[PDB]
Design a protein around this ligand. Structure first.
Ligand SMILES: [Zn+2]
Ligand SMILES: [Zn+2]
Ligand SMILES: [Zn+2]
Lengths: 425, 425, 430
């Protein structure tokens, strides 16, 4: 047993609070392999490897049939870290023994795993074996937040629709439904947003979250400048690019003000472009333009010193800016490893630089971003092996820290910081 | 001995199809050290280290004399990977026993190597000693493609002149001569390009290739929009920036249409600026503005689902974008390590990230970009050592793959994908 | 015979440690080069910006009428949040080497005893000498104000470099114009007079052993030549006491910058460019803890400069890690582009290693300046250089000793050239 494996074993014992997921609290764990293999990580990759979208997303085939088809394309993917998560979770959760998933062994695994997951206490078994105490949700702004344990599945207000999509009649309607306000004037939109916050806070929300395009640049926007764009949206007109920009800035800034008023952190996921690949599988269409800078957010950071902004960056090149900005701005926090940057090749240097330059209390190591509970463990395990390596190399060896001291840093990054950064409203 | 070495030894034995080079099939190998040491890899560095251009490119000196002068400036270069290629090549092909080329040992090498290279079968000896089975060319659009084995030296259509240089009188003349068309109208220019494709397909061509500046952003261009700029070019006008951009887009898009029709992949080398250093040696003047994104190619990737785009990026920071785009677009392939990115410090993390996140069938390991055959081996060997390292660490160790399974991955990256991606028209 | 706890990398580092250095860039005040107490070390922005970033209010740190000892005490209270940082590693190692500090960390429990002891040590008549000797420093390049007389200190020990930022960016300021007028004796209201005045500064610095000009530049800066005619308006406006529009300001800056390059050309002086800083991005930070950057830059915007001045060496530091690869490429092609150390936010092991690694394998060995301290006080030199030597030792052993089968001696020689040799040949003097 190598020193790194031992340090990792210590990290493995740490019970976690996942500060960011897309779990459906009403259907948190999977019911069959289709919930796992049918998830976009794999369908986008099967597709990317040459499987027609039509084959994967064929109308009116069973979940099991769909899994069969995807498996046929797994041979092109057996090198990916994504497929490694899959084999490791299957072995952990289902007792899967083979080193790879093939057209010859998939069905027996499907049938078997399905039985295991029909057990009444399946969700609890996953949480238990994944060292998860609690998971942050990403709730739609109109989510009733009822029907589940808000202390285990912790609400977070997703604001993307309000900030970027008031242009859409369906978005306005949902807002009207949720708040009862006619939000065609700034004062009323502000009232509406205020009601969403009170609603989220009263159900134990611990954060707001948003995904932002690389071009976004927040500024203050007065009510007068907001009123034309907002009136156009509600009158049903198509907003010009400038109107749309002004309105999104108005909404975004208003949300940051409510975060300050309610002492909520505002998670910013920066750098994503939606629907770059127009013919991709469901949830496999978003990419990014790397040409972004946190400098674009200087007005926000300066204007809201009492709002913590846990920031994830999509582009790997952006990490070093994030380090410098978390290093200087007391309200800027480095938050996990997001999406396309969420692989060992990029995690290691990112995790490494953050631990050595950012204060230890401004560093959230990791979140799962999972849609089903079973994906939590393999991704957190991947992160723990990387973290164990950095801790051992740079702290145990580099600084002569005891394993204990190094593991204590590990615990703060995985868990301690989540507790103090997201203390509750 | 070393586990990495053993894995490298197995990769060394894989016979290659070099998927991108600038070989002249009628003068494929060198005749003297002037063809080697006088190549821009070494003159640009000697000049960079402080040797005057006027000394290196003095008119009325022989190849041997020029070699002599470059050698004087090599003491400043013994650290460089480029000079490692040079020494290794000399050891392999010329029996060179010294650790470096110096004023006191170069002449003996020059006379001995020139003697070896004058041998009738030198070309064949190099290919055999390089594990090279076939090599892609990059031919001018008017290359007759005649007089050589097109299965050994495989034609590829170089499109740079058509896309960016119709402003040059001589380019228009060459195109008129080659196609018989009067391309001053859009429709005719399209037919002309079609005839270039027919010519190349008749000679077993396997791809198109182009190098692109950072500002290039492909979009469709209508005949009405193209007619203005095209007429101006054929009228001997100096095109405005916008005219030039419209014409280049029109030609580029037209070419991709033909790639789709003939089932030819379109190799894109993205991000070069020509003549950044205006007083540099021949072929040592180009650099780059790293402020580019594959996002600017989204229209292209979406509009040509049946064209494979093997992409190379110049800036190291663009690699992470490349891995993401090859991850999502079925038709985006990661293609080798280009130019300034073609050194171990950058190749390793780029090679590493590609293997772990991109499907194994969308990853072309390496091409030589060589101008003379002797440069193929040292460059490929540098690559094999990095890949061996990545395979051992991330697959053999990281995933508990057997050496065999890892070598099989390596073989696919080095050779297998070249066969499937460039199958022929 | 070797210590068992010593790796081959440690052995290589040990040989690097014995290289007597000339620091090619600092901000030492030659009249107060070393610290008098921990207030000088702990009170420096490395630690105050971090303490503040970790949650300590600036009002607490920068409270008026608080002694240096009390300020240290307050900063120590907040070091718990920082014991992971490389900056804190510098501190501990610093205190160990100079003050005999034996503890693995600095806490409220043990700081006062260290403060007291270190203040006694630093009050020794030969403290400055002691630090230099223990730091393997032979000489240090200063960054002098343009109006420094360069006569109040030993210029062979503290080597003058002309700080140009104020001339290039701040003629808008009455205080800068007045200092220039006092220094040179000129009404620089006209381009010709201003050039002559700048010329006198050069003549003054060169005759006092100056080895470089230096400047920090913002990401938007794009040097081009500027005619006297184009410059006369903005210059006149600055001297009239007017407020320069953005355009006047940018023209004037380009003009002064290009002028300075021209003098560098004339005197064969290298011009250190530190590229990529934005001032006062964080508006409520601690003193010297407000500047950040915008990564969206390219050396491509400097192309005119590099092309127009082949006889000027431009040692370049890039602020953003992403820009390093572009620097490697430009140093690789332009004879007059030189890679210069690891600057500011890039000055941490996680970034130094790949940046150092790529420079060694692609840039000619004579165009690579390994490191400078940027130090404000002498005690910061050693821990930062030691941090660097450790990275360099790793790179040298892995890529040269193992990678190219070099003897350790040959690898160390490359190390010596990078640390010291290139400093001597790049900054030989006018
Ligand atoms: Zn998410
Ligand atoms: Zn090429
Ligand atoms: Zn400095």
């Amino acid at each position: 047993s190598s020193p790194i494996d031992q340090l990792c074993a210590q990290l493995d014992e740490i019970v976690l609070i996942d500060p960011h997921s897309h779990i459906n609290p009403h259907a948190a764990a999977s019911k069959n392999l289709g919930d796992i293999l049918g998830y976009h990580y794999f369908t986008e990759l099967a597709h990317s490897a040459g499987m027609p979208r039509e084959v994967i997303e064929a109308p009116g085939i069973t979940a099991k049939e769909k899994v069969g088809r995807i498996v046929e394309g797994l041979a092109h993917l057996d090198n990916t870290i994504q497929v490694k998560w899959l084999i490791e979770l299957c072995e952990r959760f289902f007792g899967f023994q083979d080193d790879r998933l093939t057209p010859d062994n998939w069905e027996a695994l499907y049938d078997h795993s399905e039985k295991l997951m029909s057990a009444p206490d399946w969700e609890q078994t996953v949480l238990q074996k994944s060292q998860l105490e609690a998971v942050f949700l990403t709730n739609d702004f109109d989510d009733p937040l009822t029907g589940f344990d808000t202390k285990k599945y912790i609400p977070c207000l997703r604001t993307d629709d309000l900030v970027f999509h008031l242009q859409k009649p369906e978005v306005r309607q949902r807002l009207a439904k949720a708040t009862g306000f006619d939000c065609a004037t700034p004062a009323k939109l502000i009232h509406a947003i205020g009601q969403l916050f009170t609603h989220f806070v009263s159900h134990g929300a611990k954060a707001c979250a948003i995904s932002l395009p690389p071009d976004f640049e927040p500024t203050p926007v007065s009510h007068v400048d907001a009123e034309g764009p907002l009136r156009a949206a509600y009158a049903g007109h198509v907003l010009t690019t400038e109107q749309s920009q002004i309105l999104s800035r108005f909404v975004f800034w208003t949300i940051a003000e409510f975060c300050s008023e309610h002492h909520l952190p505002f998670d910013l996921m920066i750098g994503v472009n939606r629907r770059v690949y127009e013919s991709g599988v469901y949830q496999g269409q978003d990419l990014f333009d790397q040409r972004v800078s946190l400098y674009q957010y200087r007005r926000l950071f300066n204007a809201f010193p009492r709002v913590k902004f846990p920031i994830s960056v999509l582009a790997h090149a952006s990490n070093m800016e994030l380090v410098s900005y978390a290093w200087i701005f007391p309200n800027v926090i480095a938050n996990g490893h997001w999406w396309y940057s969420n692989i060992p090749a990029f995690i290691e240097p990112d995790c490494r630089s953050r631990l050595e330059a950012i204060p230890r209390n401004k560093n959230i190591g990791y979140y799962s971003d999972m849609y089903k509970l079973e994906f939590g463990w393999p991704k957190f395990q991947m992160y723990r092996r990387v973290l164990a390596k950095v801790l051992f190399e740079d702290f145990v060896v580099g600084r002569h820290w005891s394993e204990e001291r190094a593991v204590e840093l590990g615990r703060q990054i995985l868990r301690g910081n989540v507790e103090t950064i997201f203390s509750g409203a």
